Design a protein around this ligand. Structure first.
Ligand SMILES: OC[C@H]1O[C@H](O[C@H]2[C@H](O)[C@@H](O)[C@@H](O)O[C@@H]2CO)[C@H](O)[C@@H](O)[C@@H]1O
Length: 460
């Protein structure tokens, strides 16, 4: 399990993890408690898997939107800061980590996407998305491009989808309504259509990811990118003279980035909860602790009032907060991971021309409102049939969980190969047991065909 008397921290590989480890070394010097900082790939999807068995890190860092799902699953310990400490952070950052009345993490920093532009290539950046096609034509004439940013993560394309009316879950009467999903209204369709036309007309490439866009901007090959504060450090190191500014408007409306509060949660299974509290409150969330992390990769606008007063004078932070004000704080509700998966699928499918914009967003509207696991099954059902090897345990689990009947079990168990059993299952009783039946099937697959499931989720 988790080792007593030391701290293991998980944080994403784009953050200042080397600066965070320096805070860990100061902690160990004063206490004898070793602190190990790791940056596993896809840690936000690995954490609920390993923590459910009592494993994982003592502390997990991620934007707050994932933490409601974690807390609903019982994976996070309640945060209990004294009043003098709670006063040290902005109250709105505490609101981001409150779930069902309860603080479930320590807020660290406010993150929002901005437009980043090369001041030597583009002395005045475009105020509107609509002018970017013409700008790209001009820059292609000179051997450059207008704009490159990560098209593989919906976090980066959401500001444009939301600009003219898209939204995740409608907020009303103090609660999010998982009905009013707004990923398929006229504003969302217009934004994704504009994005998809950029790719169609060869102003962007559907295969551009984080590293490709970062490399191109930092080599001076593209005039603009979209990124967060963590990216400024690498541009500082490049030769690019860059500015950070408000995102372009679409149909006269501001782009609306989803605002994330980088947060540190304590594993409910950790035997080191008191050491973790001490590290986070007395070492990390101080002027010198946050400065060490921020010097490695900028955090954005920090939750710690005393340090934020210094950072707020940076014009790049002013741009971050200007974009933050035009966007929305992300919900932390458990449905957020289903929302993100739905929008990720829609953008990839529409950008490749595999689906029309309208069909992509119609699926996203349905998928955002149901469990992640159900959409996962529906999106991989052909691969499941072709690759599963171990079907009898699945049937046993489905029968004992009452998804299928005794007759179903005997009928399917009688077939000769795993592919035939799986096809009868997926086109028979699994189509008839709602989303819940597909969620039970997903759990059964992870108990019986874990490598297949890990590979399909790209966790291996
Ligand atoms: O793209 C979906 C993704 O968006 C957000 O993740 C951000 C994260 O907040 C930033 O700190 C940075 O690491 O970039 C990520 C996008 O690659 C959500 O926090 C995340 O839950 C969601 O899956």
């Amino acid at each position: 399990k988790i080792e007593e008397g030391k701290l293991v921290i998980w944080i994403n590989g784009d953050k200042g993890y080397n600066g965070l480890a320096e805070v860990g070394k100061k902690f160990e010097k004063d206490t004898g408690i070793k602190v190990t900082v790791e940056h596993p790939d896809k840690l936000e999807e690995k954490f609920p898997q390993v923590a459910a068995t009592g494993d994982g890190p003592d502390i997990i860092f991620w934007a707050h939107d994932r933490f409601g799902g974690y807390a609903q699953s019982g994976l996070l310990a309640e945060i209990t800061p004294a009043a003098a400490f709670q006063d040290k952070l902005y109250p709105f950052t505490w609101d981001a980590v409150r779930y069902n009345g309860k603080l479930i993490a320590y807020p660290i920093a406010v993150e929002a996407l901005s437009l980043i532009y090369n001041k030597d290539l583009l002395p005045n950046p475009p105020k509107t998305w609509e002018e970017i096609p013409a700008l790209d034509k001009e820059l292609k004439a000179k051997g450059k491009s207008a704009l490159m940013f990560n098209l593989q993560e919906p976090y980066f394309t959401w500001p444009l989808i939301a600009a003219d009316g898209g939204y995740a879950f409608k907020y009303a009467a103090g609660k999010y309504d998982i009905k009013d999903v707004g990923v398929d209204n006229a504003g969302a369709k217009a934004g994704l259509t504009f994005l998809v036309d950029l790719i169609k007309n060869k102003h962007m490439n559907a295969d551009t990811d984080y590293s490709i866009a970062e490399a191109a901007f930092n080599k001076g090959e593209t005039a603009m990118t979209i990124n967060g504060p963590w990216a400024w450090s690498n541009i500082d190191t490049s030769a690019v003279n860059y500015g950070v500014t408000v995102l372009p408007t679409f149909k006269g409306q501001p782009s609306k980035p989803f605002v994330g509060v980088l947060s540190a949660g304590i594993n409910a299974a950790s035997p080191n909860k008191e050491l973790a509290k001490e590290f986070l409150e007395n070492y990390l969330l101080t002027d010198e602790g946050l400065e060490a992390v921020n010097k490695d990769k900028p955090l954005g606008a920090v939750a710690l009032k005393s340090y934020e007063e210094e950072l707020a004078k940076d014009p790049r932070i002013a741009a971050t907060m200007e974009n933050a004000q035009k966007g929305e704080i992300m919900p932390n509700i458990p449905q957020m991971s289903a929302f993100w998966y739905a929008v990720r699928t829609a953008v990839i499918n529409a950008a490749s021309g595999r689906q029309t914009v309208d069909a992509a967003l119609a699926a996203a509207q349905t998928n955002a409102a149901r469990a992640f696991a159900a959409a996962f099954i529906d999106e991989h059902w052909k691969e499941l049939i072709d690759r599963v090897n171990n079907v009898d345990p699945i049937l046993d689990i489905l029968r004992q969980k009452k998804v299928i009947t005794n007759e179903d079990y005997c009928t399917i168990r009688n077939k000769e190969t795993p592919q035939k059993k799986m096809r009868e299952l997926l086109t028979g009783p699994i189509t008839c047991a709602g989303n819940k039946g597909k969620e039970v099937l997903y759990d059964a697959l992870r108990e019986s065909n874990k490598f297949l499931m890990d590979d399909l989720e790209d966790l291996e």
